[PDB]
Design a protein around this ligand. Structure first.
Ligand SMILES: CCCCCC/C=C/CCCCCCCCCC(=O)O[C@H](COC(=O)CCCCCCCCCCCCCCC)COP(=O)(O)OC[C@@H](O)CO
Ligand SMILES: Nc1ncnc2c1ncn2[C@@H]1O[C@H](COP(=O)(O)OP(=O)(O)NP(=O)(O)O)[C@@H](O)[C@H]1O
Ligand SMILES: Nc1ncnc2c1ncn2[C@@H]1O[C@H](COP(=O)(O)OP(=O)(O)NP(=O)(O)O)[C@@H](O)[C@H]1O
Ligand SMILES: OC[C@H]1O[C@H](O[C@H]2[C@H](O)[C@@H](O)[C@@H](O)O[C@@H]2CO)[C@H](O)[C@@H](O)[C@@H]1O
Ligand SMILES: [Mg+2]
Ligand SMILES: [Mg+2]
Lengths: 293, 490, 374, 371, 358
């Protein structure tokens, strides 16, 4: 809608981006190289001298005919793991957004005793070194497990529940965005009769859509890639997340680099999709024409 | 709107589960889990009860999770610091006593046994390998503690030797049979193959002392160090060893030892500097990109947008190791390229400052998308007409950024930069994988390096350094470096 | 509370777990006792956390070094094999699995570094380390190079360092003297001085890691490397005509590589010690038993004399056993934690030119000895 | 519907924006607020609404003490000065948002929105979001959103400001009708002097957080209680000449115009607390100044400004011994240059007088249409 | 600086909002844009500004094409309709913002701000953020922001809407005081008649996209080109009556009322027009026009009377000076001056008035 200019500025940026991309893609193109290289080598040529498809076939389920004659079936259900990674991250993110968002609304629109104490308590208490945390978590889900079995050990429920602990930052993030939306939009709502919840859901959320997408994206990523907690809690191979599962490729003396790199690339895929979908929620000027001033 | 009485039925049925689950936890033995579950539900139901706690209805569901999976582990960590929980003292007292009470020593001879069906009754045979003498018992019934008298025999038993399957099925009933030789020796089943003179090494007294059946030494619980010790104390202590509360010993040890203190401050500088520079860089790189990508004149933006966040998509562990490959000093593609153009090989692992630089390049590489994704959403909150106003005040792209975009972003971004500082301050992993804290800080009694973070130099004392895996020390230090990053958040 | 009347086993994901399950399926066919084999991530760390509170597997398979830690924590039961049984295995493997001069696990397989070489580039591998510099120059003229191995991690460089007299901790007669450390003595010095000399004469590169050396050998860029049985299946895909042989001698005395004896330990909290004993002794540690696991994923050298005497028909395994017998058993004492960092950093300083050999080890020793004191 | 304010005070820390204000609005009474930009008109509305906190005093809507009631439960609707339209919903969705939260029928909602959108000439714009509207259309959207909601108390904050003259008329009549059809309380804030006059059953004047005067529209025009009020009602402003008292009668005051001739004039104006000699301020409106040819008291000067309005002409004159220009209004197009000598007649029966403290001397001449 | 549009058009997809418009605005000329809410005043003003794209047509500022030139380089400044203030910056900082960008002189700024802050009566508020201000206070901050910047071509969008009638006077004046002191071109959108009549050298009447007429203030008042212009300029609205023999230099019509009187009009199914201000009392004129009073509006300075004439569906609005005591229902008569009457064609165009006005 606005009139645009020198279009050398586009040209110079297009070039300074392309060079930036190449520089930051190069470490990743190295990984795709490893996943296509035959055998398991952490280092070789970018376009490998000896390219194999066996690593990607075993990740995708296909059986492999080796040199001596015997067919190698897939050792692991790499795909199922990826499906488990999605269910666990996805539901978890839905849960993180939902919790941090309602929590945020109260910190930003409501007033109650010890608001600054809790908000600064949240920021501080999450920044504690989580070193002996795993010794504590196991003890919780072991206990919890006999009372509610659905959220115990070896359950996807338990894993999701563990991740719903880290909202402190996200609360801060959504609290912030909320504050840049004009108050008088919710006042107008209130005078139309809307309860605080209705104001939150029908007026405020729809305008906070971009930051909610951000929180969802940041959760999803965190959870696809998370290893320690999930590796500690899940025990059945067919319940493993793709992160937890690819730990099998890592051993005392050697790594199965090829198999591992192929797994590492797949875990980038669900993120790429989710990130792409969240775009329809990342729009400018949602407040446009609301308030005069 | 639903029924008005429908809410009190939901509140009553929850006030049922709570109370039922509370009493059910009080039984068998889960008490700490009961005190904490009552207060949490009480608060939870009271908040949703009266229409005056409305604000807390939004905050409580969130805080519940935080208290449970953030505060609770933090408390546990602190709680452990007051104790000697470690590799050496890992078991509870009950568990360490239990382990010593399973310990047994070989006192008598060893006879390969067989089982023989005598009609519906059983018959036991033993075989003394050392004298070539054999022994056979009367027909007996299973179940319970009984004593079988064995007679010296030349004959074979009439029954056909029993399966390992049958031995295994009847193993329980078998383990209570005390077989007695003609010479008058107590012998019991040590394995599925043998009967022997195995007897417990220790026996529980009454006042709480363990005496040894083989040596004759008496041992007493020394609740200062957490071991059994000879007696008044002697000089021999027995393992396992149990966890005992040691007041302040692990907190003081960090203040006690000159040696673990020599490189402290010099490291503390690097950790703070390392963190600030990363925070500054990631935010700056992330913010510009975010601005560049939402700029509507650009025609590949949807592709650039995606490709830019990919460093965050591929799990960091493998990325970091690939960076270790590229930054190699003689081999490795970075110094291959830097040798053709420019014609210099930088000492990325050897030289302290270039390493510190490498580490920052890589940390920026891993972390820029995060800050970008944040600014991607955050930017959408700046109304368009603010830049229409700047157009009428004659502002360009650069002027827009510094007078409008950036000031509007700093206020929300602030707590996400403070947290980023806290995270990178404790960024144990990146260092360990890439440099291992190297190169060497020559002359450190307890080992340190120039790229070592404070948490790196620490967990090498608490987990390496040869003294087992002292968790009590690790928790003491963690509590201290939290209090420092607390007094740093000022 | 470990479930009574069944066997839960833990073993790492690169061992033949499907083969182990086949042996446990034979055990179930004979005893009625159902066996279950798991391979969880970081079981070496997961096990202590569970075995403390009376849980965890009935049997755990890990390298012996870690067991001296578990046993101290009171997590492993004291095993009781008769002389007849003990004679079935190589006697030195039993030395690895002792805590306080009391046997705590069953040795299964033997793992150690050998000398891998390209048969095409080098038909006759050198018996001596001193032959290397002379052997390198005549290879460099054909574009190639003699020897490439991981210089960055001291496990790989220790064979040469300890060939003359260097040692981790003095093994008196069944007990590691934690005060007596030998990385400072004339033996460890003579080894490292020779190592730096190879880099100085530019036969070796100071910043050569595992990943680089492996790639160099599989592409025929180097004539010989130092590597374990895990690396073989890589070289088999490359279709390189290669051989595995004994490590070269330094000053006439044999290279002393670290020995890693794979062991099976019984959980001290298991109500199945007898069942587990029987499974281990009479079902696994047999010619037939080890065959099932090795058929799945090769065990390398094994502790059972009889199967080892058969495996040795493949020259590669016979080299692995040969070096392990001539080498040094990895200390199962916690004091190794300090050793690893201090010696790694010592070689790093000596190879890069940051410190001379003499002081780099003298420093390293003061670190090991005083960490083992305080 | 009856909204009453007693000793109502609003402070922003140390800055006082409403001091001890007292009003009484009966049911079905149309009360119009006026006062200078930034005097506290909206602040009063936002306290009635419950979007600002009342520092001290009582607020009674429907004889209920509403100081601590939430906004929703007040029976109050407001056309915000800053519109505050939901920028994520169409014109329709905006206007129907109130009833969608009530248990309203879809046919009730659609019928009374299509009717109220037709009177505000918004028929065609019904699907647009506020972003795709003009300033005057957004304003009309705000007015509509409240008319649809039909509350017990209508609060309207400068609701007609951004409309053309011709439309500002058409809206005025529809609001005028709605007040007479519903018979419900409307508090209406405006700067437009014409609106204030036509729509108000009663007008309130504000002055830096103080109630200057309350009264009928003609009651303030003819009888300002002080100098400020006189200067605020009627555009153009009332002219002010500094005068001196020469004589006092109970029914009138004689004063002296500051010109060289020291002319004297008797004004039908109370002499209550007025001393001979003291300096007053003579007020006279531009409309009330007579042509020179037919007057007893003549004032002459030089023309500074001439503004040709079509219907009338406005002539600013500098008359010697007065700093301020005298603004004069004449029917029809008048042909006057800048610098021309101009004389205007000043009628004593239409002269206001104010004491040194600014307070008016009640005019005793009965002007037509005042109760 | 000189500014001119040439066959300029704007569309939202295929909804036409400005239709082939043509304007020549000379340098140092004050021009006001008038039109019904939602005709295209801001759209047009914004196209000059560079905030909105131009579909077809040519835009020239300072005799060079501007269609593809970014707003910040066109040499314009603007007071937005919606203020569009900077929320993070104080009153002082908002105003001084335009200067700080074009070569900040630290002293010259403080002085020019304080000077302009004084006339807008903002001086006592300079440290405030926009949130802590009134509607009109914010509007004046917006005005100030432009006047302190001193742009080549001023663009003002309804900048006196939320100001009180008294302060509105003071701002008109100070804008004239800036107009003659600078001699800089100003395009000024306004709904206020008095503001349009007093400020403008040229008035542009816009109507649903198109230019309805251009002229001098009085020129449009006395001589409107068509039906629309008459009923837009001058408030209250000009009355319209549907009329039906013609001379050489004048046109005669018949009134649609019961008596069916015929009257000659000095002009070039018709429509007759007469303003409320032009109508006379009863006994004075020859053409008498009587009906029933409908609405009486007491304005103080005047009385405005609505009259319904038999067989005439539309109300006749009459203005008379001073307070006139007349009530609803009463019978009222008014005089109709033929020389002060307008005539409009079936389509809309006006038959040029031949009577010469002052
Ligand atoms: C060490 C840092 C390295 C970062 C480099 C990242 C690598 C990518 C290469 C990019 C090189 C940048 C060159 C800039 C070229 C100008 C591009 C351009 O001309 O495009 C501009 C994009 O803006 C914009 O990123 C504004 C441009 C920002 C310029 C400022 C760059 C300096 C960085 C300092 C910022 C530090 C912030 C500190 C945080 C605490 C267009 O802006 P406008 O239309 O006015 O905005 C308004 C509209 O978008 C909204 O309606
Ligand atoms: N949040 C605030 N903090 C401090 N002062 C304020 C705040 N909001 C408004 N004010 C001041 O209070 C005074 C009255 O505000 P307000 O009631 O909005 O004025 P108003 O009478 O509505 N004038 P206008 O809207 O311009 O016709 C103004 O002078 C403001 O400067
Ligand atoms: N984004 C848009 N999409 C479609 N139509 C629009 C958009 N913006 C404005 N319009 C229409 O364009 C017409 C004229 O726009 P605009 O110039 O804002 O009116 P205006 O003459 O300024 N009237 P006002 O602001 O009420 O005094 C309006 O009737 C709008 O309906
Ligand atoms: O700061 C560099 C850092 O970035 C990323 O860490 C993020 C993390 O992913 C988020 O969930 C959150 O906790 O903030 C962190 C940074 O503040 C990388 O994952 C990490 O490797 C890198 O060091
Ligand atoms: Mg206001
Ligand atoms: Mg407009």
């Amino acid at each position: 809608a606005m009139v645009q200019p020198q279009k050398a500025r586009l040209f110079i940026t297009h070039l300074l981006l392309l060079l930036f991309i190449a520089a930051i893609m190069f470490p990743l193109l190295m990984v795709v190289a490893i996943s296509l290289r035959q055998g398991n080598f952490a280092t070789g040529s970018l376009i490998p001298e000896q390219i194999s498809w066996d690593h990607w076939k075993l990740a995708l389920g296909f059986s492999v005919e080796q040199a001596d004659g015997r067919i190698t079936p897939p050792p692991f259900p790499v795909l199922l793991w990826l499906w488990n990674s999605v269910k666990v991250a996805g539901i978890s993110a839905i849960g993180i957004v939902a919790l941090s968002t309602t929590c945020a609304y109260a910190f930003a629109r409501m007033r109650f005793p010890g608001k600054a104490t809790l908000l600064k308590g949240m920021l501080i208490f999450q920044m504690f070194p989580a070193v002996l945390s795993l010794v504590a978590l196991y003890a919780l889900f072991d206990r919890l497990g006999e009372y509610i079995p659905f959220i115990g050990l070896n359950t996807h429920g338990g894993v999701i529940f563990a991740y719903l602990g880290g909202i402190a930052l996200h609360v801060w993030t959504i609290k912030g965005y909320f504050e840049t939306i004009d108050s008088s939009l919710e006042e107008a709502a209130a005078l139309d009769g809307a309860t605080p919840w209705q104001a939150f859901r029908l007026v405020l959320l729809p305008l906070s859509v971009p930051i909610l997408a951000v929180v969802f994206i940041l959760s999803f990523i965190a959870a696809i890639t998370e290893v320690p907690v999930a590796s500690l809690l899940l025990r059945d191979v067919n319940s493993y997340t793709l992160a937890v599962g690819m730990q099998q490729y890592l051993n005392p003396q050697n790594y199965l680099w090829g198999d591992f790199a192929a797994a590492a690339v797949m875990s980038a895929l669900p993120i790429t999709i989710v990130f792409l979908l969240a775009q329809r929620w990342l729009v400018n000027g949602l407040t446009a024409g609301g308030v005069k001033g | 709107w639903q029924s008005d009485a429908l809410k009190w039925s939901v509140l009553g049925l929850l006030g049922l589960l709570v109370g039922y689950l509370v009493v059910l936890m009080y039984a068998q033995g889960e008490y700490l889990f009961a005190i904490t579950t009552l207060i949490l539900s009480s608060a939870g139901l009271y908040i949703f009860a009266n229409r005056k706690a409305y604000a807390w209805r939004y905050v409580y569901p969130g805080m519940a999770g935080m208290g449970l999976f953030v505060l609770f582990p933090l408390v546990c960590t602190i709680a452990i610091a007051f104790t000697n929980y470690s590799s050496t003292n890992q078991l509870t007292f009950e568990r360490a006593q239990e382990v010593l009470l399973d310990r047994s020593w070989q006192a008598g001879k060893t006879y390969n046994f067989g089982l023989y069906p005598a009609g519906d009754e059983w018959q036991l045979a033993l075989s003394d390998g050392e004298t070539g003498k054999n022994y056979l018992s009367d027909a007996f019934k299973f179940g319970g503690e009984q004593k079988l008298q064995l007679k010296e025999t030349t004959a074979q038993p009439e029954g056909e030797r029993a399966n390992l399957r049958v031995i295994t099925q009847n193993r329980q009933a078998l383990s209570d049979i005390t077989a007695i030789l003609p010479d008058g020796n107590k012998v019991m089943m040590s394995s599925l193959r043998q009967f022997s003179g195995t007897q417990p090494l220790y026996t529980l007294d009454g006042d709480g002392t363990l005496t040894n059946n083989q040596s004759g030494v008496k041992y007493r619980p020394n609740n200062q160090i957490g071991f059994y010790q000879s007696i008044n104390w002697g000089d021999e202590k027995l393992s396992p060893g149990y966890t005992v509360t040691t007041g302040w010993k692990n907190f003081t040890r960090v203040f006690t030892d000159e040696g673990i203190q020599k490189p402290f401050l010099a490291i503390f500088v690097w950790t703070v500097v390392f963190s600030l520079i990363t925070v500054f860089l990631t935010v700056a790189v992330g913010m510009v990109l975010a601005c560049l990508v939402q700029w509507e004149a650009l025609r590949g933006k949807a592709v650039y947008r995606v490709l830019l966040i990919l460093p965050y998509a591929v799990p960091s562990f493998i990325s970091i190791l690939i960076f270790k490959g590229l930054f190699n000093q003689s081999f490795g593609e970075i110094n291959m390229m830097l040798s053709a153009l420019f014609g210099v090989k930088p000492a990325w692992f050897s030289d302290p400052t270039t390493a510190r630089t490498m580490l920052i390049i890589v940390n920026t590489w891993l972390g820029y998308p995060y800050m970008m994704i944040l600014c991607m959403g955050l930017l959408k909150a700046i109304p368009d007409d603010l830049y229409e106003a700047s157009a009428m005040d004659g502002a360009g792209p650069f002027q827009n950024f510094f007078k409008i975009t950036l000031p509007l972003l700093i206020k929300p971004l602030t707590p996400l930069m403070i947290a980023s500082f806290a995270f990178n301050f404790n960024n144990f992993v990146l260092i360990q994988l890439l440099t291992n804290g190297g190169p060497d800080r020559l002359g450190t009694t307890t080992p340190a390096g120039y790229t070592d973070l404070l948490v790196n130099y620490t967990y090498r004392i608490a987990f390496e350094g040869g003294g087992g895996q002292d968790f009590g020390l690790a928790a003491a230090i963690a509590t201290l470096i939290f209090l420092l990053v607390g007094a740093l958040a000022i | 509370k470990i479930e009574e009347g069944k066997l839960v086993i833990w073993i790492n994901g690169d061992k033949g777990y499907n083969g182990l399950a086949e042996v446990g399926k034979k055990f179930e066919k004979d005893t009625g006792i159902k066996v279950t084999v798991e391979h969880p991530d970081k079981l070496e760390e997961k096990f202590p956390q569970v075995a403390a509170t009376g849980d965890g597997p009935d049997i755990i398979f890990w390298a012996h070094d870690r067991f001296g830690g578990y046993a101290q924590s009171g997590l492993l039961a004291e095993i009781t094999p008769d002389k007849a049984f003990q004679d079935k295995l190589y006697p030195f493997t039993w030395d690895a699995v002792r805590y306080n001069g009391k046997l705590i696990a069953y040795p299964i397989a033997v793992e150690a570094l050998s000398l891998i070489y390209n048969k095409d580039l080098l038909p006759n591998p050198p018996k001596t380390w001193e032959e290397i510099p002379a052997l390198d120059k005549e290879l460099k003229a054909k574009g190639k190079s003699a020897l490439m191995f991981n210089l960055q991690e001291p496990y790989f460089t220790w064979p040469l360092i300890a060939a003359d007299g260097g040692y981790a901790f003095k093994y008196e007669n069944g007990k590691y003297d934690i005060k007596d450390v030998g990385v400072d003595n004339a033996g460890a010095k003579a080894g490292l001085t020779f190592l730096v000399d190879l880099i100085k004469n530019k036969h070796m590169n100071a910043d050569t890691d595992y990943s680089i050396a492996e790639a160099a050998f599989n592409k025929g860029e180097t004539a010989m490397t130092i590597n374990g049985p895990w690396a073989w299946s890589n070289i088999d895909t490359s279709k390189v005509n290669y051989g595995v042989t004994v490590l070269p001698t330094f000053k006439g005395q044999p290279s002393k590589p670290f020995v890693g004896v794979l062991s099976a330990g019984i959980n001290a909290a298991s109500p199945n010690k007898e069942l587990a004993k029987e499974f281990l002794e009479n079902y696994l540690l047999t010619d037939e038993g080890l065959e099932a696991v090795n058929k799945d994923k090769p065990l390398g050298a094994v502790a059972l004399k009889s199967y080892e005497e058969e495996l040795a028909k493949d020259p590669r395994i016979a080299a692995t056993m040969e070096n392990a017998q001539k080498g040094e058993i990895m200390p199962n004492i916690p004091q190794m934690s300090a050793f690893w960092y201090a010696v790694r950093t010592a070689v790093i300083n000596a190879a890069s030119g940051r410190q001379t050999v003499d002081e780099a080890l003298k420093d390293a020793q003061t670190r090991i000895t005083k960490a083992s004191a305080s | 519907a009856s909204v009453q304010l007693q000793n109502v005070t609003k402070a922003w820390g140390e800055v006082v924006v409403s001091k001890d204000i007292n009003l009484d609005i009966h049911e079905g009474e149309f009360v119009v607020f006026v006062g200078p930009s930034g005097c506290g008109k909206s602040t009063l509305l936002r306290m009635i609404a419950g979007l600002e906190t009342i520092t001290s005093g009582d607020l009674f809507i429907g004889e209920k003490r509403m100081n601590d009631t939430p906004p929703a439960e007040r029976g109050v609707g407001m056309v915000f000065q800053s519109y505050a339209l939901y920028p994520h919903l169409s014109v329709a969705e905006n206007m129907s948002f109130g009833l969608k939260l009530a248990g309203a029928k879809k046919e009730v909602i659609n019928q009374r929105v299509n009717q109220v959108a037709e009177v505000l000439q918004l028929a065609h714009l019904l699907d647009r979001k506020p972003k795709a509207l003009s300033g005057g259309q957004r304003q009309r959207v705000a007015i509509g959103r409240t008319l649809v909601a039909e509350p017990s108390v209508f609060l309207l904050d400068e609701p007609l400001s951004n409309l053309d003259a011709a439309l500002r008329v058409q809206m005025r009549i529809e609001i005028s009708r709605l007040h007479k059809r519903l018979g419900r309380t409307m508090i209406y804030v405006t700067h437009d002097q014409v609106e204030a006059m036509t729509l108000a059953d009663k007008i309130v004047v504000l002055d830096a957080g103080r109630v200057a005067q309350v009264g009928k529209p003609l009651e303030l025009y003819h009888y300002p209680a002080d100098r400020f009020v006189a200067g605020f009602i009627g555009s153009p402003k009332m002219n002010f000449l500094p005068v001196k008292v020469t004589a006092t009668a109970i029914d009138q005051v004689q004063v002296e115009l500051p010109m060289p001739n020291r002319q004297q004039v008797w004004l039908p104006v109370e002499s209550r607390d007025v001393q001979v000699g003291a300096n007053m301020s003579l007020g006279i409106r531009p409309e009330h100044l007579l042509p020179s040819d037919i007057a007893d008291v003549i004032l002459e000067g030089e023309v500074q400004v001439v503004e040709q309005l079509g219907n009338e002409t406005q002539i600013h004159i500098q008359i010697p011994s007065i700093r301020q220009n005298l603004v004069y209004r004449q029917n029809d197009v008048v042909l006057v240059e800048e610098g021309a000598t101009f004389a205007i007649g000043l009628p004593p029966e239409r002269c206001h007088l104010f004491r040194e403290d600014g307070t008016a001397c009640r005019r005793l001449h009965k002007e037509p249409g005042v109760a």
